[PDB]
Amino acid sequence: ELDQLRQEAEQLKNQIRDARKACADATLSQITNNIDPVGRIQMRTRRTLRGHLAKIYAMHWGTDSRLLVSASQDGKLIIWDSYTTNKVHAIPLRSSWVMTCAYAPSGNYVACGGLDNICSIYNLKTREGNVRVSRELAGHTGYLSCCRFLDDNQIVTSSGDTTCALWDIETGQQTTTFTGHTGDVMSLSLAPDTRLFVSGACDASAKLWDVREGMCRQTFTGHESDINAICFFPNGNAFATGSDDATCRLFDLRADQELMTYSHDNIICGITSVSFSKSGRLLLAGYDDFNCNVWDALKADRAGVLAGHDNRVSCLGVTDDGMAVATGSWDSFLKIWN
Amino acid sequence: VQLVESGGGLVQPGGSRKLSCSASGFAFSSFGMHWVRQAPEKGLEWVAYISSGSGTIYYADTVKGRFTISRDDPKNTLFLQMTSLRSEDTAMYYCVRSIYYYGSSPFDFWGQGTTLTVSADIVMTQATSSVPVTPGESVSISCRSSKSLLHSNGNTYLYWFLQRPGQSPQLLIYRSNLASGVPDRFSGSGSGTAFTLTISRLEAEDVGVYYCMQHLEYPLTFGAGTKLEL
Amino acid sequence: QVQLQESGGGLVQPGGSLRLSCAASGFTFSNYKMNWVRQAPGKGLEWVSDISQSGASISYTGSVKGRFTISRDNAKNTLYLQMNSLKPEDTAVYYCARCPAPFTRDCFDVTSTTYAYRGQGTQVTVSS
Amino acid sequence: LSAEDKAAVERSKMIEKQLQKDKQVYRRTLRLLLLGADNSGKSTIVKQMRITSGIFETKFQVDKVNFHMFDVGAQRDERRKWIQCFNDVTAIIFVVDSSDYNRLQEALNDFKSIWNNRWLRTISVILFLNKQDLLAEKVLAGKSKIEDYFPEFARYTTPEDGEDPRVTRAKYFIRKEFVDISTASGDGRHICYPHFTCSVDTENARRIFNDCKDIILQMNLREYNLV
Amino acid sequence: TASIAQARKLVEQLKMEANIDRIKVSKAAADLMAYCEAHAKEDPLLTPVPASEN
Amino acid sequence: SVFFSVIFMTVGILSNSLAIAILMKAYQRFRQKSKASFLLLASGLVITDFFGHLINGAIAVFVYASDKEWIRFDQSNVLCSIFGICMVFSGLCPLLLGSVMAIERCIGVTKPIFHSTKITSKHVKMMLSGVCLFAVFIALLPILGHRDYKIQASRTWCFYNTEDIKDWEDRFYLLLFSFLGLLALGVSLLCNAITGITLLRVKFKSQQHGRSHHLEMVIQLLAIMCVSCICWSPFLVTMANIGINGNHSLETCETTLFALRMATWNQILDPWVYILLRKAVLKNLYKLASQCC
Ligand SMILES: CCCCC[C@H](O)/C=C/[C@@H]1[C@@H](C/C=C\CCCC(=O)O)[C@@H](O)C[C@H]1O
C-alpha cells in the first residue's frame, strides 16, 4: 500500500500549495513602492582584529555589544573586545575541526563543536581562573553545524545526521528530540520569544520546530539549492534564508509563504551567512565573491558593498543594538564595520 | 584556592627577610599578585604589585628601593625580599590575587598573611570611623574622595573590603557591580566623588571593618575603615 | 518547489528501444548539471551518464558507452534518454538527479543514499 | 588608560605570544587528508604506519618530520559540505581499490568530483593504487578483465616509455585514465601524483615524503612567481 | 518494512500541517512595514549616528 | 648633472611605488597559504631602497640649489656626514638583503621541508632586524672612529676619503666595504647558481608530462645575477684598487662617477628584475594601464 500513501501525500501537498497560493492577494514589491528608498548606506571598518592562526569560521555576540566570541579552525576560541581591541581569553580546543560557536546570554558558558561529533561547553567564570572542560557531551552520528543557547540550562545543537535534540547542561542528556529533516542541517536561528525556532537543511527546506513540543509546525520548500544561511527577524514573525544559487528568500511565519526574493544577475556566488540589524531594514549577506552586500527588506535594492575581505566571507553578525557588525572571513581577519 | 605565607617573626632592625608565599588551587601565572600591609590597630596599605611574567612591577612610593618582589612561575611561588627594616615595618602582610578583564573581580581572594615585628596622589578619607548599630536597622557608610574616580571609559574604580576579626578581608564590591560569593544585601551608589555603601539586612556575620580602595592609578591608598560592633 | 518526475520504463524485450523522460520544475533547468544514475536490485547506486548545462560536456560510463544517448531541451526543461540494444543486466531503477551547486564543474553526492534532489526513478526490466 | 586598562594590554600581549608559540608548533608539523570508499583498504594503510568520533587523527614521524593524517571516522555519504573544511592541507591521499571493477567507476567519479572542486583547486590529490597483487591475480585468472567494463581498453597499447606484461598494460591504462581525468580543467595550478602500492610494502612513507616535498617546492615556486 | 512507516509519518505530518491557519500577504506586509517604521528611530545602521555616541 | 640625478630619483620612486603596490596585492592573497616570507623581504627591500633614493635625491637637490657651495650650507660638517652615512647604507643594506633573499630561496628550493617547518617567520624577522642593525652599525662606524666623511672630487656627494689617503683607517674602511660587498655578491651568485642547477636537474629528470614555474625562475636568476655582477663588480673593484694603491691610482673621478651611476641603476632596476619582470605582474600592469587609460 505504498502507492496509496504516496498519492495521498501528493494530494495533501497539492492541497497545501493551492491553499497557500489562494492567500497570495498581492506581492511585497507592489506594496513597498510608495516608501522612500534606503539609499547607498556606506560603512567603514572601525576596528580590525588580528591574531587568528587559521581561517575564521564562526562568531557570536553576547547580550552586550562589547564582547564577542570567535572560533578558529586551529582549535582556538578567542574572546574579542570591540572597544579596547584586546584579547580577553583564549580557549584551546581538543579538536581543531570546529565549525560553530555559541555564547550563553548569562555570559558564563561558551559552546563549540564540529566534525568531532562532540559538543564541548566551557565555563568562563571558573573560580580557578583557567578554562576547564565543563560539559563534553556526545551522542550524535554527524558533524555539528550550529549550536545556540536558550538559557543557562538548555542548549540546542544541530548535527549532520539529520537529527537534532535539546541538551541539558545539568545532566548532559537529550531532553527533547525531533524527527529531523530530510537533509543535513546547516545553521540555526532562535526566535526572541524562546518558544519556536526555524531550522534549515540541505534539502532546500526550512522547518519551524517548537521547544516544548517535539514537532514541526510549518515547512517551507521554496528554495532551489542547499540553504546555507538562516536568520530570524527581530520580531519573530519572518526569517530570511540564503541558498547556493545566489538567492535569498524571506519566509513569513504568520503568512507561511515566500514574501521577497533577493537575487541579481551579476551575482553567482552563494550566500554564506545572513544577519539582521535591530530594525530589520538592512540585510547583510556574505557571498563567495570576496564581497558582502547590504539589501533593503522592503525595496529589495542594494544598499552597500563591503570589499574589506580577501577570501570567502565565512560569517557576519550584527549586535543586539545595531551599533556595529562583525564580519569574519577565511583570511583570518575579523573586521568590525560601523 | 589556598595562599600559604611564611617567613614572618621577629627581625632585628637593619636586617633582611625573604617572605615566601605558596599558591595552590589556581593558575599562579595568570593572576597578578599584590602585597597589602596592615599595622596593628591601623588600616591597610598597598606595598607592591607584580603582573604575569614579571612584565610590569610597581612599588609604593614609601618603600622604593628597599623591597624586591619576584615570582617563580614553574614552581608557583612568590618571594618578597626586605632589606634595612625600620621600627615601623612591624605589620602583617597579605598576598592578594587579581585578574583584570571585562567582567572580572580583582582582589577577590585574600591570603592568610604573616606577621613581621622589628625590635599628592589619590587618598581616600572617611568622615566616620565607628558607627554603633543594633540588629534590625540598616547600615549606610558614606565616603568622600579628593579626585573624581569617574574615568573617561565610564568605569568606577571603587573596591570594598570587609575584614573580620581573625579572618581575611572578603571582597564585597569590585566596581555597584556586586561580586561573587556575597549576598545581594550589599549595594553601592553615588557619583564619581562621593560614594555610599548600603546594607539591606544586617546579619551577625557582617560585623567587621569596611575599607575602601581606588584603582584609578597604580599607587593605591586605603581609607580609614569603618568598624561595626554588635 | 524542486520537483523531478521520471516517465517511461517497464518490461522491454532485449534488442528494443526505450525513451526515458525527466521533467524538472521549480528551478532554472538551464543552470544545473543533469545526471542519470541506476540502482540494481540487491546493489547500490551506480552512475550512468552526466550532461552539463549547455550540453557541451557529456559523459557516459564504460558499461553502456556508445549505446545510450542523453540530451536536454531548455525550451521545455526536459531531459531525454534514448536507450538502444538493451541487455538483461539493465534491469534496474533509473534516477534523474542534478548537482546542488550551480555554475560549477564539480558534482558531489551523485550516488548518495540520502539525496533529496532526485526523482522516484523508473524500473526498467528486460526478460522474456 | 587606567591601570586596569593597561593590565589588559599586557594580558593581550601574553595571549598573542602564546598564539605565536602555538602557531609555530602547528607549522612545524604537517597535516594530510585521507579519503576513500568503504571498499578500499585504507584501514590496513593506517595500521601499517607504525613508524562516535567522526574524525580519526594519526600522528607519525617520517624523516624527522611530523605528519598528522586526518580521516573520516563515522559519517554518512554526504561529501559536499565537510569537504570545504579540509582545505589548505599539505596533501590529500585518495585510496582506491583497483582490484574490483564495479566500484572502480564510482571511485573515478569521486576523484573527478574532488579534483574539480572550486575550493580545493589549490590542493594536490595523491593517488595510491592499492591491492596490486589482487588485481594481478584477477587479470591473470582470465575470469574478469577490463574489456567487459571499459571498451577503450580494446584500443589501448602499452607505451614505449618479473612482472606479467598484461598487469603492466592494465596498470598503465589505469594510470593514463586517471591522468586524463585529472588534467581535465586543471589550469596547471595543481598536479596529481599517482603511485603503485600494496598492503605489505613499507616504502610508502618515503613516497609520501617525496610527494609532500614536491608539493612544498611547487608552492614555493608559485610564491616566488607571484601567480 | 521501514518505508511504509516513514510514509505514514510523512502523511500524518502533512495532514497535521495542513490544518495550520494562514492569512493574506497584505496584513503581514502592513505589520512588517509598521514594525520597520517604529524601529527605524533606534537603528544606528540606518540613521547616521554621530561619533559622540559611538 | 642635476638631471643625471633627478631622472634617476623619479624612476626609482615610480619603480618602488609600483613594486610596493604589487607586493602588497600579492601578500594580501598569499598570506593565507604560506608564510609569505619572500614577499615580506621583497617589500622591506623595496621600502628601504625607496627611502634611500628619496633621501639621496633630496640631499642632491639641496646641494645643487646652492650652486655647489658646500661652505654655505655646511659649516660644522653635519650634512656631509649624514650624506655619507645614507650612501653607505644604500650601498650595503640592499646587497645584504639580496644575499639573504638568495640564501632563503636556495634553502627553500634545496630543502623545502627545512624552510616550511624549521624556518619560522619570527626567525626571518629577527634575521632582518640583525641585518639592519649590522648595516646601520657599519654606516655609523666612521662616525664612531673620531673621523668623518670627506668631500669627493665631484663636490656633489660625500663618501670615504679617496683623495690624499695617508692614514690607514681609511684604507681599512675601504677594504672592509669592498670585502663585504664582494662576499655578499658571491654568496648571492652561488645561491642563485645552486638554485638554477637544482631546477634544471629536477626539470630534466622529471619528464612525466610542467615548466610554467621553473623556466621563469631560471630566467629571473640568470638576469638578476648578470645585472648585479655587471653593475656592482666594477665599483667594488675600483674601491679596492684605490684602497690598496693610495694616491698612486691612475683613474680619475670619472670612473667612480660612472660606477656610482651603474650602481644607482642596479638599485632602481632591482624591483624590476625581482617583482616587475614577472609574467603575471606584467599582464596585470598592462590590464591596469589599458583599463585606467
Ligand atoms: C653606493 C651605491 C648606492 C647607490 C646610490 C643611490 O641609488 C642614489 C644614487 C643617486 C643619488 C645620489 C648619489 C650621487 C649623486 C649623483 C651626482 C651625479 O649625477 O653626477 C640621488 O641623488 C638620486 C640617486 O640617483
XYZ file of N, CA and C in Angstrom, chain E residues 11-41:
93
model
N 2.702 11.325 5.854
C 1.303 11.660 5.605
C 0.683 12.312 6.835
N 1.004 11.797 8.026
C 0.488 12.398 9.252
C 1.027 13.811 9.442
N 2.315 14.017 9.162
C 2.890 15.353 9.276
C 2.233 16.319 8.297
N 1.975 15.862 7.068
C 1.339 16.727 6.079
C -0.092 17.069 6.476
N -0.859 16.080 6.943
C -2.236 16.347 7.340
C -2.319 17.163 8.624
N -1.271 17.147 9.452
C -1.257 17.998 10.635
C -0.842 19.423 10.288
N 0.076 19.582 9.331
C 0.492 20.919 8.923
C -0.566 21.601 8.066
N -1.384 20.822 7.353
C -2.424 21.403 6.512
C -3.490 22.133 7.320
N -3.643 21.804 8.602
C -4.638 22.448 9.450
C -4.162 23.775 10.027
N -2.933 24.195 9.730
C -2.424 25.456 10.253
C -3.094 26.613 9.524
N -3.603 27.575 10.289
C -4.273 28.725 9.703
C -3.262 29.668 9.058
N -3.683 30.300 7.965
C -2.848 31.230 7.223
C -3.648 32.480 6.884
N -2.940 33.600 6.753
C -3.571 34.884 6.468
C -3.073 35.413 5.130
N -3.593 36.563 4.714
C -3.213 37.161 3.444
C -1.830 37.801 3.541
N -1.316 38.223 2.385
C 0.006 38.838 2.339
C -0.059 40.311 2.728
N -1.193 40.972 2.481
C -1.296 42.403 2.751
C -1.178 42.701 4.241
N -1.807 41.879 5.085
C -1.748 42.111 6.525
C -0.325 41.949 7.050
N 0.364 40.888 6.623
C 1.741 40.678 7.058
C 2.655 41.785 6.547
N 2.435 42.237 5.311
C 3.244 43.324 4.767
C 3.028 44.613 5.550
N 1.774 44.920 5.891
C 1.493 46.117 6.676
C 2.098 46.018 8.070
N 2.040 44.831 8.683
C 2.639 44.656 10.003
C 4.150 44.838 9.952
N 4.801 44.269 8.934
C 6.245 44.434 8.799
C 6.613 45.890 8.540
N 5.826 46.584 7.714
C 6.098 47.992 7.446
C 5.939 48.833 8.707
N 4.904 48.555 9.504
C 4.718 49.285 10.752
C 5.853 49.008 11.729
N 6.283 47.747 11.828
C 7.401 47.412 12.705
C 8.675 48.129 12.271
N 8.936 48.168 10.962
C 10.125 48.852 10.464
C 10.054 50.352 10.722
N 8.890 50.965 10.486
C 8.751 52.396 10.737
C 8.849 52.721 12.221
N 8.471 51.781 13.088
C 8.571 52.020 14.524
C 9.998 51.840 15.029
N 10.732 50.874 14.478
C 12.082 50.584 14.945
C 13.168 51.312 14.160
N 12.808 52.086 13.133
C 13.811 52.858 12.411
C 14.411 53.975 13.256
N 13.705 54.430 14.292
C 14.214 55.504 15.136
C 15.315 55.041 16.083
